[PDB]
Symmetry: C3
Subunit: 216 residues, 3 copies
């Protein structure tokens, strides 16, 4: 894999979304992974409907979202099926913006996650209950010294959009959250990589997956 990548510079990442204090909004993180593969394969960078997955498939993880989009034969755009944050009536008669064919799980191994992110944006499940995570505003790498790294205690899907290094002891992941641009660094967090925590900071390397699509 390359020494660094940033899918935001490669036209595969949509704007940061703000879920608010939602009643049911578990599919962000998966939605950006669909957006990434749709952009790479079809030349189209379009936000997809996190709300349609929630309304038509309800908690859940990224693979539950991928499975629903595959079963439905696609997903509507966020513009045609907007976000409310609360579970409402499922509408299936909406235009399709993106379609995927499968999904792949990444093993709990930092090297395998790096390889996957070199290919496309990857959804991951992380622990987010520490106040230090909640209050992260940058400007630098998040060390997560109070994060729980137990894979069993993760609670939130986010999207890895890249990685790189600022020097020894400063390898990182670039992670898109859905908490709006008044969180992190314009809505992103730079999470330390290549630490002595085998499951990764906040268990980031335990639960990676990404959607796949048939092409010519």
């Amino acid at each position: 894999a390359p020494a660094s990548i940033d899918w935001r510079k490669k036209g595969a990442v949509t704007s940061v979304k703000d879920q608010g204090a939602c009643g049911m909004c578990w599919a962000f993180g998966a939605t950006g992974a669909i957006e990434g593969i749709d952009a790479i394969t079809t030349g189209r960078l379009i936000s997809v409907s996190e709300q349609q997955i929630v309304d038509c498939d309800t908690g859940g993880d990224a693979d539950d979202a991928f499975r629903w989009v595959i079963t439905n034969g696609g997903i509507a755009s966020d513009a045609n099926y907007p976000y409310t944050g609360v579970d409402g009536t499922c509408d299936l008669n909406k235009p399709i913006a993106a379609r995927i064919d499968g999904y792949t799980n990444v093993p709990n191994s930092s090297s395998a996650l790096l390889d996957a992110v070199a290919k496309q944006p990857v959804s991951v499940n992380i622990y987010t209950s520490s106040t230090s995570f909640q209050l992260y505003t940058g400007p630098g790498i998040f060390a997560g010294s109070s994060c729980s790294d137990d894979p069993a205690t993760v609670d939130h899907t986010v999207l890895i959009v890249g990685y790189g290094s600022n020097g020894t002891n400063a390898d990182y992941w670039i992670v898109k959250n859905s908490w709006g641009t008044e969180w992190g660094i314009d809505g992103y967090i730079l999470i330390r990589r290549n630490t002595n925590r085998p499951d990764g900071v906040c268990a980031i390397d335990a639960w990676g997956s990404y959607p796949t699509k048939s092409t010519s």
Copy 2:
């Protein structure tokens, strides 16, 4: 800014439209500016519905069009909501092709307009009542010696898609009209720039604006 730009060569300009002798068709000029920012930011070059703005928001200027598209949460494609030239029933249940978030006014200063066109296609309001403008067919730069340059007497929105220079006394703007390809140079006019008329030929530099969009 660069010495020249032509957004038609950069994949940000759709075909020239023909408004005919319309009853109500004031939103061309604004529509191409939306198309430009949608292409630049999403990788998609799609004509948008000038008719939907007219039906759902009726005269008006480009900012009235931008304001309506922002308020509606987007605009349909011209293919899904075709042009008739006459005000008809507003249809809001149509797929969304483009969405924008804001708009910016350019000061009445040629340098600020040049900077804006180096960034994206820009809508401008011009005076168009001189027979010389009506009968322009090229093949060269339009000098507009009979044009009125009073900002108060402009009457039509068009779209600046580029600029350049053919030598001293031959600086120009590249302007897309909506009068079909049997006007101008395949529907465009090359309007002299950097003259001694402070508001510009036909007041072109008085009323520039352009739509903006949130990105990753």
Copy 3:
């Protein structure tokens, strides 16, 4: 024209489709040509609805498909109007994914077909009733020694997506079929070009055509 081209490497070819044992499915081959010009001109690589042409226009050749899409003012996506293989109720109230303006017939001359494929994917009509064609799995060039080359006996539209040469006596066309990826070389056939058969192997050079679109 260049010595070789492969539109699959240039972002203009969608996944291979599988028509199955259809009751009515004559528009594949034309559909990929629309997809090609839509990708080249609009930056969008999207499968279009072969089923909508069949439902709304029924046999036929590629020009019948082009004529229907022009008359309808566009064609829906395959995602919004899925394939069944059997003629059913025509639905015209579906979002438009692609629009074209005209079509051009290629003369029965290999050089003119090469020039057309250097410009975009081209639909062609071929004879497909020989068991050797049916059972082609590669891995090399199809010589078609049992193919009928009579233009009057062609029976199926396919799509030329490129051409090249592997040496003297090994010039070829790259042809996308709609028989799924368990036919040919992942759904494609490499048909010998520049033979002593004037109408081409399986009459491939007799009936080329392609759709055209107005642009800026």
